[PDB]
From a paper:
The enzymatic oxidation of aniline for the synthesis of conducting PANI constitutes an environmentally friendly alternative to the chemical polymerization because it is carried out under milder conditions. Even if peroxidases and laccases have been both explored as biocatalysts for aniline polymerization, laccases offer important operational advantage over peroxidases as they do not require stepwise addition of hydrogen peroxide to catalyze the reaction. Besides, peroxidases are sensitive to inactivation by hydrogen peroxide whereas laccases only require oxygen from the air to oxidize the arylamine, releasing water as the only by-product. Laccase oxidizes aniline monomers, dimers and oligomers.
The oxidation of aniline by laccase at pH 3 is hampered because at this pH aniline is mostly protonated, in the form of anilinium cation (pKa = 4.6), and the cation (E° = 1.05 V) is much less oxidizable than neutral aniline (E° = 0.63 V). Even so, the polymerization reaction with high-redox potential laccases proceeds slowly, in several hours. To sum up, even though SDBS was the anionic surfactant producing the strongest loss of enzyme activity, it endowed the best performance as doping template for the enzymatic synthesis of green PANI. Hence, 5 mM SDBS as template was fixed for the next polymerization assay with increasing amounts of 7D5 laccase and 15mM of aniline. The maximum polymerization rate (measured by the increase of polaron signal at 800 nm) was remarkably raised (0.37 < 6.37 < 14.64 mUA/min) in direct correlation with the amount of enzyme used (0.1 < 1 < 2 U/mL), suggesting the catalytic role of the enzyme in the polymerization. In all cases, polymerization slowed down from roughly 8–12 h onwards, most probably due to the inactivation of the enzyme. On the contrary, enzymatic polymerization in the presence of SDBS as template led to a nanofiber-structured PANI. By using a first-class laccase and SDBS as template, we developed an environmentally-friendly method to produce water-soluble conductive PANI with excellent electrochemical properties in up to 75% conversion yield. Its nanofibered structure provides additional advantages like a porous structure and a large surface-to-volume ratio.
Numbering used by the authors: 1 to 160, 163 to 356, 363 to 430, 432 to 492
Amino acid sequence: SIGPVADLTISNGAVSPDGFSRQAILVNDVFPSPLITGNKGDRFQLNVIDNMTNHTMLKSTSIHWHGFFQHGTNWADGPAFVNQCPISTGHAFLYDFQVPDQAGTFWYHSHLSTQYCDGLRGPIVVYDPQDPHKSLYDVDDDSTVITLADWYHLAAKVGPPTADATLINGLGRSINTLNADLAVITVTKGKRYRFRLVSLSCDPNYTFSIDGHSLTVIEADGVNLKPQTVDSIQIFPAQRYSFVLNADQDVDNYWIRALPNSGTRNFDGGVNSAILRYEGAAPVEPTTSQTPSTQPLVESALTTLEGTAAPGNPTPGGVDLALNMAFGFAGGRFTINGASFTPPTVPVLLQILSDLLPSGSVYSLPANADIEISLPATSAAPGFPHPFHLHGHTFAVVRSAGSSTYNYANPVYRDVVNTGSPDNVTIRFRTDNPGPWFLHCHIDFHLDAGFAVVMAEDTPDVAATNPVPQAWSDLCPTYDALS
Ligand SMILES: *[C@@H]1O[C@H](CO)[C@@H](O)[C@H](O)[C@H]1NC(C)=O
Ligand SMILES: *[C@@H]1O[C@H](CO)[C@@H](O)[C@H](O)[C@H]1NC(C)=O
Ligand SMILES: [Cu+2]
Ligand SMILES: [Cu+2]
Ligand SMILES: [Cu+2]
Ligand SMILES: [Cu+2]
């Protein structure tokens, strides 16, 4: 793997992760993008070298480092026209930030239009030398990262959508390439694995299970939690989980299954599937049967390892500022409280540094306060369920999707939450991270359609807390000169 100091060169190339050839986005000449790695407290210097020539997938790029807090380095966070102008082709831009107090499973991806759907997306693992669950597993390496990804034969900016295939570790089969190579995951009988599940999906959620094995979940979106055995896991776009697998079954091949909520909802011919292979097992497809899932993961039954409480007082409205976000759908555009987000000419953070634009979308947040955000599900926002995600913060899921109850005493903490179907998912966080932070649904087409708002956190202090490198100031004129 690479990092925490590395070059990321972005280019275009042919790929065939399902046997069908299409042009896509490469990171250091490989599809899918390589895993980045660091220890807790490393300083990260990821030099992003834009060498793209393909206009249909945009020649420009910017990278968000999903989950990282970016305290004092809001300029480094990624979202085009919120925190930076995009890097232009022929140029490079250094992302220089630290991760002092985060550790766990994360990822990086394009935050420009729909560009990460064309293959610029990759796992990040920040190991903890003192990890609290270390004693529960023997192996925790590059071989135990598992990524889930949707794959489309025609580019993001080519059709509307429906995945042609599911990619586990970059490999999978579509309905017309049932013979294509599958992803193989190799364990040794009697060893224990910390598997790091990473959804790179642009849209589908996956119900993930492994034939013949139970999963003990110990981490969600970077947050250590109390161990919790399950036999399947619903993972929504941009979410992460660590589960320990006790490789204690017979030496054999076992189907790994990852079934999307949309499109091809079967396992016929090994679509939506990969292979757990015990060492010594033959190089064949598994022939194992799947059991009905009798202990699925339940977000409202998850709790933080330390049992941390929700910020604020343990009662609704028991907070410094309650904001309710009302979803809708106008032209071809999503709306929250009546605003559709259109990317502004001057990125928000630059406006601050210079009411913010785009009007109707920007929410001033005071510092050192408790915030409660409501996001009731509604049929007025088609394409639900929507997984909303808050940059620059972990939040406490005081009430999950599918539930009516309210947990303030020890709710799970996360950075991406399913908001459910027409449900009133509510979250809490403390404002200790001054800057403009994107709040948006992570189904990436809905995002390009404007399904987003920006939290302008402690705006009087953003100028002081986030000094900006010369290279970042150079970004916008360069971009604006391009036709
Ligand atoms: C650029 O990528 C698009 C999207 O996959 C593809 O349709 C097009 O052929 C590519 N351009 C070239 C010159 O290969
Ligand atoms: C969701 O919860 C907030 C919290 O008070 C409330 O104001 C809002 O009306 C609720 N919406 C629905 C649809 O239940
Ligand atoms: Cu993300
Ligand atoms: Cu993010
Ligand atoms: Cu959505
Ligand atoms: Cu985002």
